[PDB]
Amino acid sequence: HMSIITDVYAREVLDSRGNPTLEVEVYTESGAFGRGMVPSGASTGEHEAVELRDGDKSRYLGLGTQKAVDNVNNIIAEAIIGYDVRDQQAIDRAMIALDGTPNKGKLGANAILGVSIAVARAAADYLEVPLYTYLGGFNTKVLPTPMMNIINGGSHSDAPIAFQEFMIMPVGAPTFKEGLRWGAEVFHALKKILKERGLVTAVGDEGGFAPKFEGTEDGVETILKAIEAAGYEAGENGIMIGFDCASSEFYDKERKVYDYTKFEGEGAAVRTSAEQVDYLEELVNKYPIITIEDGMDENDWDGWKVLTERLGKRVQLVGDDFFVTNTEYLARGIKENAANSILIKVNQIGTLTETFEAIEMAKEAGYTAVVSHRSGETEDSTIADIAVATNAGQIKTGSLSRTDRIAKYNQLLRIEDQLGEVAQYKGIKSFYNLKK
Amino acid sequence: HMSIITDVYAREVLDSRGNPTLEVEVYTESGAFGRGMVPSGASTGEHEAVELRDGDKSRYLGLGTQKAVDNVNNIIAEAIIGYDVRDQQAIDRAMIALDGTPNKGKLGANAILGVSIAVARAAADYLEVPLYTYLGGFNTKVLPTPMMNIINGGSHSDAPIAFQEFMIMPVGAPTFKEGLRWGAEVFHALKKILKERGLVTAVGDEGGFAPKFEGTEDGVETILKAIEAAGYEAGENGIMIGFDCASSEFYDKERKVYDYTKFEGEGAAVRTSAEQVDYLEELVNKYPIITIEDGMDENDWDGWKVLTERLGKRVQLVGDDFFVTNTEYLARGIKENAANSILIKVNQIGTLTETFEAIEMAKEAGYTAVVSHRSGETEDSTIADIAVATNAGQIKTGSLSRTDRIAKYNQLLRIEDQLGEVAQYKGIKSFYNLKK
């Protein structure tokens, strides 16, 4: 019978921005095909995947991938035989299982995830259901409600922007083609203002700017005066704002304190979780905002034991690296009731089956799981299309400018080129943690 | 190359108390063998991984488990297809990373432990050696001492005993072939005095009697006075004393109060993070308490920064359902240093591979790791193979008067009779929390 996956392998090249990669392929006895791959990068001492490089200095600083690929290669294949192409979930599990290290450090979760996404495109020329519809069944009409960081700060930056990011959620628009219009183009009106101001207009690595203001409090006036000048009102009338007032980045572990001299000048504020809270609550009165991301720190679980009676029913607090996507920190998170939202990043979990599992376990409880990026994207769509796999809520898939981001945002309306009138989504009324 | 797990088969079963649980058989090309069945019973509020229950009336009550093996049958086996039977690292991590859910609810923590036990026997049904001597290497030779459920309290009786059990070690016996009996000749001397006083001699689910002792006096004190009358001497030259506490159940969550009235009657008291050890400090000087167990609540963190510094240099603080075995809670209790032994419960940690990793990591943190009972247990010897495998100095093996406890020694003494000479011995010098 022609349904079998017969042979599996991976190859040796560079990712976008040009650092080495670990890249994976799927084929069938029927002749149907798919490549599958990953975002690039991780930390240490925290529950993510493991990044593995044979340190031989002759090429690209010694950051070559060959340790993994010449381990991985014929080690994946000897597990994966006697299966269909629709045997996705058995395949996904079987390669984490084959790695058999608790930290996913023999194959790397980034090789396992490679075959996972590769099988999730390979029945399409055989069943005639794509990707998300293949995974989830017939429900999957729904383009997600989106968000982006066009205004960077934090760990990645030359800017004063001590928030790790200034963000928008273009929620207040009844069709995805009306979130992707009312203020993403307005980044070029910002470019005209930056040129008039005499500032630089080089892009940040998400596709946005790290704009060189005299301080981060001018970007606070910029967006809600730009939308006022666009002829529309800073409420449900178009768009709502997010921040990443980056708790884990301004937190000092030794002093137990959020101190902004991490990013800012000689006079910058020193705040424990209690000064940080007795500051932060006001942002729903001030000039309105709907969201913050990494609202309290990865170590500052006590800061999350502050935040519920204080901000909890006023703002969406996205636990981003506060959870590092992970189902273990999330499963602690909901029992301790730490945050009210989570960011979900595919190599911080390690298979399609684990990514949809985290999103569904969050959806049956009510935690707003935003399926999402890392700064390193690849020549793939699939990190975005997991947002269609259940209709859940919301997505964070990078800035509207980069080719490796357009490889998702093109898909997020090329689906609508086939679906047309069949597409629908939830609006501002998508924050299934808020307005109850 | 007759080396392979060709097929493995979960099978439906009853358990003790007269309900159901899960069992497994590994078959092979060689006709070689590996059954696995599990210890039964679990706890709540603090994490334990899933046991599965159903709406069925046909295979017992609705606590019934035909269910798990009404559907799990075709799942677990294929993740291990074409594998060598040995590699329990790459094979339990494979069945763990076949469930993948954070609470292990797809397969169930009874299922992954069942196939883990099956694969363990099957791995020496290849390696030919006496399997416990695989689990620890050949050097399964540094002999542990018992501690046990000598006097009743908690769930099992009318009796006013808020202590989860009182405890001792036999300490004066120069070799374990006496040292087991020199903790057990005690028990028949006690039982004769129970008949004479008119106390009951029927046994509970925990294999001790259901007596009616009054708090800390005559029930334990008959096992003071015996180690004088029996010709043994008043301490280490003899038997030495200890307590265990139902702390996280008698710790009232509204009053922040230890209140004994759940398990005691009208003689009960009222205490906090403080006054619990303003009481217990006066006691270890008075009864020779070489051990206290589970003394303080899960969330009473100062309760452990009290008991582990207000007394714990004179006492082994065994954490138990403070820890619930879980490696995450154990890592917090290591980092904050909240106990100086851990009671380990096999089904609180989901597989023999994760039981072995938990026990190894526990001695690397310097804790006496103490493997221990649940409430109903099935006649597979493999959790007794964990005794000879571990080479430490202590086990909470259980009272020598019920069939689930007796069944360990049909393995340990028949292993011992194969070797004779191999032992290095402890008795009292049995801790890594004393004589520093």
Task: Give your account of this protein's structure.
The structure is a homodimer of 436-residue chains. The first copy, chain A, is built from 17 helices and 14 strands. In chain A, a hairpin with a 5-residue loop joins strand 2 and strand 3 (33-36). Chain A has 436 residues and is of the alpha/beta class. An eight-stranded mixed beta barrel of chain A has the order 4-5-6-10-11-12-13-14. A three-stranded antiparallel beta sheet of chain A has the order 1-2-3. Chain A has a three-stranded antiparallel beta sheet with strand order 7-8-9. Chain A folds into two domains: 4-128, no CATH class; 129-436, no CATH class. Chain A is globular, with a radius of gyration of 22 Å. Chain A starts with 8 loop residues before the first strand and ends in a 17-residue tail after the last helix. At the A-B interface, helix 2, helix 13 and helix 14 of A face helix 2 of B. The PDB classes it as lyase.
